[PDB]
Amino acid sequence: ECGRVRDFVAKLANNTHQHVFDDLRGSVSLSWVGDSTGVILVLTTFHVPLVIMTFGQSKLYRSEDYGKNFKDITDLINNTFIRTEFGMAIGPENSGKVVLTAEVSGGSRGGRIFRSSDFAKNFVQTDLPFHPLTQMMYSPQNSDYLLALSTENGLWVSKNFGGKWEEIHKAVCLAKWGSDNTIFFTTYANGSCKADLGALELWRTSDLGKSFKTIGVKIYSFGLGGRFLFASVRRIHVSTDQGDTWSMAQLPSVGQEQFYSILAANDDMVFMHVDEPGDTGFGTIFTSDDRGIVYSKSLDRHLYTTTGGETDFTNVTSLRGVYITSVLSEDNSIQTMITFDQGGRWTHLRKPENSECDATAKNKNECSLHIHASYSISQKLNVPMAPLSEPNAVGIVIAHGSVGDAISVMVPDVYISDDGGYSWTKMLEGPHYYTILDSGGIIVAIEHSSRPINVIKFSTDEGQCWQTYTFTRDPIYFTGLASEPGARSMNISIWGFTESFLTSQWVSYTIDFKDILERNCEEKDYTIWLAHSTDPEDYEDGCILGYKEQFLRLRKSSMCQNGRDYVVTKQPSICLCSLEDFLCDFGYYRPENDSKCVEQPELKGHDLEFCLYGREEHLTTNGYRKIPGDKCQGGVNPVCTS
Amino acid sequence: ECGRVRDFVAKLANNTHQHVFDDLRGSVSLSWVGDSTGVILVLTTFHVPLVIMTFGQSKLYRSEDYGKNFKDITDLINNTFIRTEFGMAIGPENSGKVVLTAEVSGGSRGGRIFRSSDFAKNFVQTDLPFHPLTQMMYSPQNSDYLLALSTENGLWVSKNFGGKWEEIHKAVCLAKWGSDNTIFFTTYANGSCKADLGALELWRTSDLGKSFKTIGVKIYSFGLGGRFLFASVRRIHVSTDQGDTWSMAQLPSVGQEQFYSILAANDDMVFMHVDEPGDTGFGTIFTSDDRGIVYSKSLDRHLYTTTGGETDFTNVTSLRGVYITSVLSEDNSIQTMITFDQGGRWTHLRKPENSECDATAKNKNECSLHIHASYSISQKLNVPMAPLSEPNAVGIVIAHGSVGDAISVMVPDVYISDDGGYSWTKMLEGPHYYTILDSGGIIVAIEHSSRPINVIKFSTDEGQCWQTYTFTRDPIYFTGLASEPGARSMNISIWGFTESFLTSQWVSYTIDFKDILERNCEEKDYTIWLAHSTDPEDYEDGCILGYKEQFLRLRKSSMCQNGRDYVVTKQPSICLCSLEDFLCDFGYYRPENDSKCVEQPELKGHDLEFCLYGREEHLTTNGYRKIPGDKCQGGVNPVCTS
């Protein structure tokens, strides 16, 4: 049914441009630099410990022909080499500023970082006054403010893009950026940074080092998500006033000292993972409020990695308000869940109809899909990539799955989704490396195996119809692929080395899908769909977090070029509030399957706290809270550190 | 000069026996079971998280024909599968008892472990009363006493080899064995085991659970090396009376709370690694005494992994009293050191003469050899195996090296040694997997690369002359190799899967080197050598730790079959004591290069402690202590927990 297009092999072979770099010692990196420019950097990095100094000139290449023809520019990288952990630090989006943190063969004063500002078309060298411990970090408000960490725990900042390097503090553990060039960092005061792990001091500077202000003492670490600011004392504190107020988080249970973990922090609320007594590897997800202080139960049996803390929690970026994670069950098996109201109510993933298990083993109960993510990756399962979802391409999600078999754990297979996670379908066999470009118009996949591959699998209709193309007759060992950074982008680049019967030489392939996408998608090529509605009312067919939006979708076998935004509703319409448009309240949880939020097995009734006590005004109510960000009206009536 | 033997390709091809297992889902394991029997087990294991229960029948194969012909015995492993972390637990040496810790597809009561006692020729099934968290541990005094850890932190013991399973304690964190069926284990008392990490209680039972005795409280963890017993409070305690006395270790420096790490514990002394202030990744090695209480400085700049604690410390098992580790230097480069008096005096590795750097770059100072070990492996360097040394084959050490270049860090190359580490020589290019058999008479190596290999490299004269053999025309992706477990053993087994243009099917190759080793090594094929002497006196040419022993060595191009012990001195002769026959004393260190132990920069003079104070009798002396185990006489005159 998927058919084909105007015989595509000729159009791809004309657009598949190969360049060979021959012998390149070390691991080869590759990255595009901006769109509508055709600049590709090829840097060789060495996995060398940071403490040791040694010789070696890392090679560097640059193509200004959209990857059609490269040019050796190692002349710049003379007597210098870049480590693998360092790599290439690419500027954010249209900044076009790349820095290469290198080290001299025998240099001792500091590293020789190479800076460019015109999308890596020409560089300017400079010598750091220190040996950098971490790669340069960018500032959000301006890309010309650089953060660095010295080997002697020295914090340096650059106001003029590597020009001047002033030091901020000499006893800095870790440091991050904040809203509008705000720099947060912890500080030790006795020998080693890691020696004072149980008690540090978190500072903050609003003027890039000139004004300091101690914001927190006796701390494990700190974080920064959304508009929030966190600090771990175990105990945890949430801050909104940039650290001026650290009201502790209050939770229903936590009998002893349950360990906490911030899953993800939206600009509205923040997810937190709290463990269970006796470890055992499961916990519960707590959903906060508009301030991130009071938390409500959201999900049980939440699996996490016992050694690390990673979990299958995934933010479906395609659809707003959809998240996916894996949990245990009554039969102690692996099952993944999904929510459509941002942690309000979770539900089981409906098994894919066009997949092979409902007819394979119906007598056996367990064969639900398991979307692999960071929990499976942390457990060293054969999972190359986490679920992928681009916000421009709404609904589109691609990930690795499993059907509750030991073979599917070793071989996950690749699943697709256009409903934003509500419905799935197995499309590819085995592990793959996939990428999304053209705002979902193209989805390229590459097989992950021990055998040298030479085939690329792509789909031009949002993963509905997959085509197979052999980009070369010399099978390469896959090293990686890169996408051109554009909303309308259509070139990609695959690179790897060939087995040439000794003397393995590298080679990069750059493919352009323009001649494939001849036709422009007319209105005859689209279909209109609505997000899944967990509400039974007919006048609420897609009110994700309050409002209803209509989206469009390329039809099957669509080999055309899209240029429209996948959301057709310019100004969305607000629906009346629903039961799923409301989050559970404190001390209340929504049991499995059912949709009515009931009381947690308690009767005494509590009333939170506020850091050093000073409790609430006691709001009883039932167990429903307006979801932070859910814009609806009517429908259902609701009831420390110095 | 190395020549060849009576055209060996025919003798190997007749002894190279191949068997194909076809499609085997999961990772394939293989292991011999005793010598002079020809039993090989081939088990497929799955890398599945322990918490989840799922379906799957793991396949099992057994060959009773020395690997010439296998036989499918999956009939036993019915509705059961073995995880990768579990694998096959092989009995110690001539016990011939193998257990396969499996799990039922839907079983919940406990695992179905399969036990055998006649070298895996026939098994007996049994159902565990619990889900095992760890693989069975063997007891030293008797192989029929099994230790296990339940998923609910339950400690179980088996008196009759899986027959009866009695529980010992319900709140057990970790547990190990001890001298004569003694079981040591820590215990928690508040919710989780890991929640009470700062304070546990270490118990001990001498009668397999009937009599308990609390031996230590407020503990991080515990260890057991040699005849010693350790407990971490940071602080560390050393015990000899099986835990009845925990006299704290005293060290010269340690200004604040330097972190400690026990490197290796001999039956005489014990090495300890103590970190430096500010981390930075280097520390000092401390050598203890005959009791392991008072420690002396031994080496500076000792590199360790900052995230984990691994270090290049290696026990050269071939020569008694030789150890190797890597340290920093004045030029902040990587250099490995070696001692011949068991931590008494370290010296730089003399650069290999027949290697390419002394003529490549003499103007540049740094190009010493760097023997890779656990420090490089922990840093994820391309190092497959640590240094290998079998005690039967004296002098023989094989390891991966480096010459202080970024390329040599990515590609280590394989170095050999017959002087026990004093002299080295590069023999093979690139990373390899190597093994030793025939008590050093055969040394097999296999190339480690991304390309499917079909060539085996071996040497029949203690790594002096290497030969190359192509064991098949179907290149396989190397999975692993196994050696027959015998002092006179001569079969090996290599297994892996072939790229068959999809449907990769497995295949195992078993090679016998008997027809290669026709001749028996007469006295015309040996040479006599003595261990390196760090002493200038001529009448002490090889007095390692006191006594002098004469060893023998197969000459170059020796293609014969040895049957003699490589140490010819039946009763060794005691040398008079030397300066290297004495260890530095407390508060004294031996500086670099020179051999005179001098004072640590201190003048006040201290006098140790004894747990709750009660200090010493103040023995001043200079800075020399008799090495624990060094048997010499004359020559040089020398001067907590409840």
Ligand SMILES: *[C@@H]1O[C@H](CO)[C@@H](O[C@@H]2O[C@H](CO)[C@@H](O[C@@H]3O[C@H](CO[C@H]4O[C@H](CO)[C@@H](O)[C@H](O)[C@@H]4O)[C@@H](O)[C@H](O[C@H]4O[C@H](CO)[C@@H](O)[C@H](O)[C@@H]4O)[C@@H]3O)[C@H](O)[C@H]2NC(C)=O)[C@H](O)[C@H]1NC(C)=O
């Ligand atoms: C799952 O993934 C989705 C992505 O689809 C995430 O949603 C994104 O959330 C981020 C924020 O977390 C959005 O990014 C930007 O947030 C800015 C907030 O910064 C302001 O903070 C304080 C608030 O008082 C201000 O005082 C301060 O001055 C900062 O300005 C917004 O300001 C941004 O708005 C921007 O929009 C226009 C668009 O062109 C810009 O030009 C403006 O300059 C303006 O700054 C923006 O909202 C991001 O937009 C969200 N994505 C989408 C698609 O909505 C979810 O957060 C994530 N889930 C979780 C749990 O993390």
Ligand SMILES: *[C@@H]1O[C@H](CO)[C@@H](O[C@@H]2O[C@H](CO)[C@@H](O[C@@H]3O[C@H](CO[C@H]4O[C@H](CO)[C@@H](O)[C@H](O)[C@@H]4O)[C@@H](O)[C@H](O[C@H]4O[C@H](CO)[C@@H](O)[C@H](O)[C@@H]4O)[C@@H]3O)[C@H](O)[C@H]2NC(C)=O)[C@H](O)[C@H]1NC(C)=O
């Ligand atoms: C570097 O590597 C070398 C290996 O070459 C290590 O040397 C080995 O050390 C181990 C011990 O650590 C030796 O193994 C055995 O140790 C036993 C000690 O157990 C006794 O402990 C107390 C002591 O009072 C006794 O009361 C108790 O009852 C135990 O018996 C010895 O007893 C062993 O002797 C055995 O020898 C014969 C040989 O046939 C046996 O049949 C006997 O049953 C007897 O038990 C043995 O010594 C091992 O032998 C050492 N190897 C060599 C080649 O000497 C180094 O320790 C290691 N370096 C470091 C730092 O760990």
Ligand SMILES: *[C@@H]1O[C@H](CO)[C@@H](O[C@@H]2O[C@H](CO)[C@@H](O[C@@H]3O[C@H](CO)[C@@H](O)[C@H](O)[C@@H]3O)[C@H](O)[C@H]2NC(C)=O)[C@H](O)[C@H]1NC(C)=O
């Ligand atoms: C995918 O790759 C192709 C080529 O590999 C890119 O097409 C190239 O786009 C550039 C930019 O427009 C073209 O250069 C232009 O040439 C004209 C005429 O010489 C000149 O007037 C412009 O100033 C500009 O230099 C280039 O000719 C063109 N090459 C081909 C073969 O079409 C394409 O842009 C890439 N895809 C994306 C999304 O960028």
Ligand SMILES: *[C@@H]1O[C@H](CO)[C@@H](O[C@@H]2O[C@H](CO)[C@@H](O[C@@H]3O[C@H](CO)[C@@H](O)[C@H](O)[C@@H]3O)[C@H](O)[C@H]2NC(C)=O)[C@H](O)[C@H]1NC(C)=O
């Ligand atoms: C390396 O492998 C070879 C074969 O792959 C092993 O040789 C085999 O050794 C066994 C044990 O002695 C021999 O079996 C014996 O056969 C005789 C006569 O039938 C019988 O009387 C004995 O009771 C015993 O069963 C077997 O014939 C022999 N095979 C060959 C081809 O020689 C060899 O032992 C292996 N190496 C080592 C070190 O074990």
Ligand SMILES: *[C@@H]1O[C@H](CO)[C@@H](O[C@@H]2O[C@H](CO)[C@@H](O)[C@H](O)[C@H]2NC(C)=O)[C@H](O)[C@H]1NC(C)=O
């Ligand atoms: C760049 O590379 C060149 C050659 O590879 C280096 O030039 C040599 O430098 C040394 C000492 O720096 C001089 O003694 C030689 O005379 C130079 N060669 C020539 C032909 O003049 C140069 O050092 C490298 N750049 C840096 C910064 O080290």
Ligand SMILES: *[C@@H]1O[C@H](CO)[C@@H](O[C@@H]2O[C@H](CO)[C@@H](O)[C@H](O)[C@H]2NC(C)=O)[C@H](O)[C@H]1NC(C)=O
């Ligand atoms: C061993 O394997 C056999 C077949 O693969 C299993 O036999 C079946 O068991 C189920 C329930 O246990 C019965 O309903 C079937 O009738 C059995 N098959 C036949 C042909 O009789 C057997 O269960 C497996 N062993 C275990 C312990 O599960």
